[PDB]
Homo-oligomer: A and B are copies of this chain.
Amino acid sequence: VLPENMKRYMGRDAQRMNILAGRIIAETVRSTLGPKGMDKMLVDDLGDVVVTNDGVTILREMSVEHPAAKMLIEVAKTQEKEVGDGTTTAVVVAGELLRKAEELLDQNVHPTIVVKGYQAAAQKAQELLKTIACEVGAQDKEILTKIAMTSITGKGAEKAKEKLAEIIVEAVSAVVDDEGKVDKDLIKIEKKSGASIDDTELIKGVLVDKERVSAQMPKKVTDAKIALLNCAIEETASEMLKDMVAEIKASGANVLFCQKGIDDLAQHYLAKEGIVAARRVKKSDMEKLAKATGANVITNIKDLSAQDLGDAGLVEERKISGDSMIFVEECKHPKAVTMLIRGTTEHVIEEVARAVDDAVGVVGCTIEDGRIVSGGGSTEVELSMKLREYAEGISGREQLAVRAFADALEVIPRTLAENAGLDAIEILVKVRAAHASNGNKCAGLNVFTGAVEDMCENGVVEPLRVKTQAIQSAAESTEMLLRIDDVIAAE
């Protein structure tokens, strides 16, 4: 019935091999954990080399084969989609939970138990995070900038996390409008090597990596009237093509972003009418311009009217490190912003782009959910301390599964020190004792000095959503996988 060459294991052998696949992913990504966490270098299918610490990025790009190892990718994806940061935290916990669950299966604790106890400990772990969760101002600059900075840490970009946090919190506050719902789509991440990271800046409008299609065209437009065309400006015959150009002018348009192409003839006449134009504009960028300037994306040029034009105070072609770009700035009421990233090298600003991708996310999460928790592994410590006592209260077979859950949660404290160059064993003893004695806001690992400290006092904080979604995805993926005792792959 079964193809020869495929491998099939049963009982503890099915569970050992399949679980181990997930454990491998955790042992890989655990190196990125923490404010003093390390980085990875990933090379895509084109040869392009990426320097990043983002766990979801690592798992998405890398080539995993086994379904169970692929499930931790799903954990990373839900963490990215909902939170942005904590993607490694979610995976490594899920893998460690799998690791301890396999040791538990090895001790001959029936799969019916490990599923139950892990479910119990995970349901309590969620309550515990919500229990210690401290209410903060949704739009409070200070706590938002502390989120932003701690998000950036553990990445190559942390060298200048302070300048980044400022423009990232302002970027979110700019586009969010009301209080609130934050959508990371309205905050564009542009990067161009040159200068330092301190030179990174926020542009109140839309910045596109486009150029003025003709040398004769104006390089600067004031009190700009922006038109958004999606139909290519390409017409057989000079009369018909110039008609299209004339209609743009007739609507009062002075700036023209075309999603498709612009014929050389149209570029020429456009220059004569004092209209600045860019071709091959990203469809997404067309929508950013519509939101920012209030410009209307129109299909037929015949349909373009003055009512379809958006406003921007300045539309100007500027060179950054030689490469020309178009800044659409000083919009009346923009709903989209762009952050142009600077840095010493292309690979550095790639990491900065990943640092701000996470940071700008989690800044939004706290504006939506006005609860925050202490970072530096402080939560996970609180979770292990209580869930160990929980295990004792539950008793029976379930206590071993809850003990395995709680012990697995210490992978974060454990690796926060490990890759920070601190002794994992010694630190965890000092931290766990420090928590039980000093309290909840008075513990966790300070990987920056390499000792137990007060995470909350030192502004080492992460949104509640980070840690809640991390536990949810991580623990639910484990408790789900613990039910699976058969893997069937189609040919």
Residues of A in contact with B (beta carbons under 8 Å apart) = 1, 3, 21, 24, 28, 31, 36, 38-45, 49, 51, 53, 58, 61-71, 74-75, 78, 81-82, 110-113, 119, 156, 159, 183, 193-194, 214-216, 230-231, 238, 264-265, 267-269, 287, 290, 296-300, 302-303, 321-322, 344-348, 351, 397, 419-421, 472-473, 476-477, 480-481, 483-491
The list of the 7 closest CB pairs from A to B, nearest first, reads: A110-B421, A112-B421, A39-B483, A268-B299, A344-B476, A43-B489, A40-B486
Q: Return chain B residues, CB-CB under 8 Å to A36.
A: 112
Min C-beta distance of A50 to chain B, whole Å: 10
A254 CA to B491 CA, complexed, in Å = 47
Q: Nearest CB to that of A181 among chain B residues?
A: B319
Q: Return chain B residues, CB-CB under 8 Å to A265.
A: 299-300
Contact A268 to B75, CB < 8 A, known contacts A61-B490, A473-B345, A486-B31: no
A3 CA to B159 CA, complexed, in Å = 36
Q: Nearest CB to that of A115 among chain B residues?
A: B38
Contact B81 A67 (CB under 8 A): no
The 10 sampled A-B contact pairs (Cβ below 8 Å) are: A1-B21, A3-B63, A39-B483, A41-B484, A58-B486, A231-B264, A268-B299, A269-B303, A348-B480, A351-B480
Contact B194 A321 (CB under 8 A): no
A193 CA to B469 CA, complexed, in Å = 12
Contact A346 B1 (CB under 8 A): no
Min C-beta distance of A353 to chain B, whole Å: 14
Listed residue (A41, A63, A346, A489) with the most chain B CB atoms within 10 angstroms of its CB: A41
Q: Return chain B residues, CB-CB under 8 Å to A267.
A: 299
A448 CA to B91 CA, complexed, in Å = 31
Contact A43 to B348, CB < 8 A, known contacts A38-B483, A268-B298: no
Stoichiometry, as copies per complex, reads: 4
Listed residue (A38, A53, A480) with the most chain B CB atoms within 10 angstroms of its CB: A480
Q: Return chain B residues, CB-CB under 8 Å to A488.
A: 40-43, 58, 61-62
Contact A419 to B39, CB < 8 A, known contacts A66-B1, A473-B345: no
Min C-beta distance of A172 to chain B, whole Å: 16
Q: Return chain B residues, CB-CB under 8 Å to A346.
A: 74, 78
Q: Return chain B residues, CB-CB under 8 Å to A485.
A: 31, 38-40
Contact A484 B39 (CB under 8 A): yes
Q: Return chain B residues, CB-CB under 8 Å to A39.
A: 480, 483-485
Q: Return chain B residues, CB-CB under 8 Å to A40.
A: 484-488
Contact B51 A24 (CB under 8 A): no
Contact B215 A322 (CB under 8 A): no
Min C-beta distance of A304 to chain B, whole Å: 10
Contact A347 B71 (CB under 8 A): yes
Q: Return chain B residues, CB-CB under 8 Å to A49.
A: 67, 70-71
Contact A216 B345 (CB under 8 A): no
Q: Choose from B41, B302, B348, B421 the contact partner of A486 (Cβ within 8 Å).
A: B41
Query: What 7 additional pairs, Cβ within 8 angstroms, besides A1-B66, A40-B488, A112-B421?
Result: A41-B487, A43-B489, A71-B347, A231-B264, A267-B299, A268-B299, A268-B303
Contact A63 to B490, CB < 8 A, known contacts A31-B485, A74-B347, A297-B215: yes
Min C-beta distance of A262 to chain B, whole Å: 11
A64 CA to B298 CA, complexed, in Å = 47
Q: Return chain B residues, CB-CB under 8 Å to A70.
A: 49
Q: Nearest CB to that of A159 among chain B residues?
A: B119
A66 CA to B41 CA, complexed, in Å = 11
Q: Return chain B residues, CB-CB under 8 Å to A193.
A: 78
A403 CA to B395 CA, complexed, in Å = 43
Min C-beta distance of A89 to chain B, whole Å: 15
